[PDB]
A paper describes a structure:
CtfB contains the acetyl-CoA binding site and the PS01724 signature sequence which includes the catalytic glutamate residue (E46) sandwiched between two short antiparallel beta strands on the N-terminal end of an eight-stranded mixed beta sheet.
Additional support for the necessity of a carboxylate is that mutation of the catalytic glutamate to serine results in a catalytically inactive enzyme that cannot catalyze either the CoA transferase or hydrolase reaction. The E46S mutant is catalytically inactive. Instead, a second acetate molecule binds in the space normally occupied by the catalytic glutamate carboxylate, 3.2 Å from the E46S hydroxyl. Acetate molecules were identified in every CtfAB structure in the substrate-binding pocket directly adjacent to catalytic residue E46.
Residue numbers in the entry:
A (entry chain A), B (entry chain D): 1 to 213
C (entry chain C), D (entry chain B): 2 to 215
Amino acid sequence: MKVVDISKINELVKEGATLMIGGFLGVGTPENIIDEIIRHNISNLTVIANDTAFEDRGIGKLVKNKLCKKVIVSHIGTNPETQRQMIEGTLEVELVPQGTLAERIRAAGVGLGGILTPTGVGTVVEKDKKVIEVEGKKYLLELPIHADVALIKAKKADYLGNLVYNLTAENFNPIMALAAKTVIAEVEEIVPTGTLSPNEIKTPGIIVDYIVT
Amino acid sequence: MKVVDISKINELVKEGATLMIGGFLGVGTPENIIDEIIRHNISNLTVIANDTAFEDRGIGKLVKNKLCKKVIVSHIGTNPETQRQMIEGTLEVELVPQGTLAERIRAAGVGLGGILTPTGVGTVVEKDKKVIEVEGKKYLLELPIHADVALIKAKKADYLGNLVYNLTAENFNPIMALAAKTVIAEVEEIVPTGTLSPNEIKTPGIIVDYIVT
Amino acid sequence: NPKEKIAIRVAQELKKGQLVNLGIGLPTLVANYIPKDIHVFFQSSNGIIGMGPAPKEGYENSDLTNAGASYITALPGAMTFDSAFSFGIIRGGHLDVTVLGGLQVDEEGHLANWMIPGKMIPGMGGAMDLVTGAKKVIVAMTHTAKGTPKIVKKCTLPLTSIRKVDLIVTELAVIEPTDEGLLLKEISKETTLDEVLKLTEAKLIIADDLKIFA
Amino acid sequence: NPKEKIAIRVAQELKKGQLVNLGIGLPTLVANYIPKDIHVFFQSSNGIIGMGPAPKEGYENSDLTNAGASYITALPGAMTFDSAFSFGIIRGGHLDVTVLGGLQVDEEGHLANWMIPGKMIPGMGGAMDLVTGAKKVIVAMTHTAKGTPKIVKKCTLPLTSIRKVDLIVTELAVIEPTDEGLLLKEISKETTLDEVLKLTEAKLIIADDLKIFA
Ligand SMILES: [Cl-]
Ligand SMILES: [Cl-]
Ligand SMILES: [Mg+2]
């Protein structure tokens, strides 16, 4: 019963939801889940992702339809319309160094209060961050990022919802799957249990609540 | 080349070395590498591991032969000789919660100044730790553990040194592989490049320095 | 038999599809008593979701053990992982239920279960992470230590965690720590309420609902 | 040609067996000029070790790209991984060399290369992590922004990190930031020392043995 129709997105993605969405410039993004969110104009989203992809693709489609109040991302240069909405003041943009975002999301998923990283030290990224020195090197305290729903993409799921990824479509998806309260995984193929080995699986079915097509 | 004779251990592991050694109660431990260290009485070692296994096995053999000055581990209860040496003062033992230890080692391996965790709060392990509050929850600041040499076990390596693990022999190995300055990986089989898929490999060859049998 | 009364009663607390970790010892007997219409997934902290019963002779695999290094099987759909991932499941609030043994629980719901000064020095292992992180902690425990109450006003033994355990289960009682102290919800058919209170040093609130089962 | 002069010069800095990351844009041309006798491994931060050239037509894979979403190949022995692993490689000091583009370098070796206030806001991406973490950072950069010096006393554009880059390479000079200022180590064929000093607002220490190359 993890597999559901895409229609069920509207019961799961609330208005104003804070969402984690996988994908590197639209590689390893749940485009179908995205399209449904647009079909039903679920808006005022706080979207946590690596980027806003392109105006024509993935998360960038959410931005073109102005369904985002805020994006927490590391990169927006490929999407000129994310740039315009940031500037016109309709879209808060919290820039996060890609590796800090990976570990902040991870910290939420694995139950850490935060991580200390040297990245960003001495840059605008130090603003309003606790600074901690450990044996004389300074680090920014970086804090866990939570979300209501993780909208991830994967190559295959077995009947129990175990997931494997493909090449550079992995990026942020397995990490988001552990951090959000509810995890919806868009996948390309459903395969029998025993097709994905214990040594190959990267996301266990137990943490995947819903699956689509 | 990465692959060397097991004899070369006495060249790479020094007296007084700080070593991370993989394995859970001797499952996924480099039993040959340990045997070499015993053959040549390389001693005064600081060993970082999940446990000291049993008197007859794995790290427990290092303790039987009194080759450790210190162990940093989460469990020592299965090995009465580690307990005997601790009491008698010959063996310093620093107990660490198993999940804290995974993340402390990981932090060294991935370049973090430290991690904050709720484990240990309000127990003896809060002693001599900085405490940090984040949204009203208390955490311990826990700190990177580095080592001179990681002694890990894996199932297979390809010609380039990529490693895969097997089942619950994985435990601490892939993590220690990223934390130590030099990495020696005991493997059971060496296989052609292209035998281990990009989607399956868990430790890339680039971080593995030497490999034995 | 007192251990079976406990394991059978804990087994009833588990619901379909949960991820469950059983501490070594008394809690491992819980697996013997799952209702058979209830299917769960076992996590072992050494790095497996999907643990199964010990293998028939000859089907052992040297790389596949429980957290005490004893040979297990893996069931269809199991995942194996490193120790950092293992404790992201445990500390990250993805383990629905952990069933651990006990030395003492006090009325703040605090568990002490990993060390006795002057005797047992085994280390904590994953116990501190399990107690701190499991969605639900169930303590499975003889009611007394050779007659001494184990449910006490305040733990005198070293705490595993300051997290409030969600359920104590003994051969005599089912007790639920709450904001207002320890709440006695059930008592064994083979005992009486006077006996339970006499063997609990801690202050017990007795429920209006009071049930008899285990 | 001025970008070709730079790519060729950076390529000679690469040693056998190194893990190398190339920023998008100018640094990626470095891949075109590796000595045939030097074999290195490329990391793309979206999650691959073992990146290779773009595929022939028909050999594209939608799930295999560089950090610009442009199709690549993977070579035998490649590994792909999640973005936390990717930046554990980078931030944890297992990336031997990163070659990045530059807007300004200053005389402390500080690089600014991710934002121009008011003109472009693409975000930092992984630049801050790469510069903070790579064993060796090489900046590959046209010498002047339409005449304006890019090697300056103190960066006026926002810093990518306070780490001291290990090498600057322009069409005109090779400069190694050091404890006591910027050291000009080589001068272009087709330029003169007088020309470099004029086009460098920053203070340059000049090396006893100054060479000709890029
Ligand atoms: Cl069997
Ligand atoms: Cl090809
Ligand atoms: Mg969930």
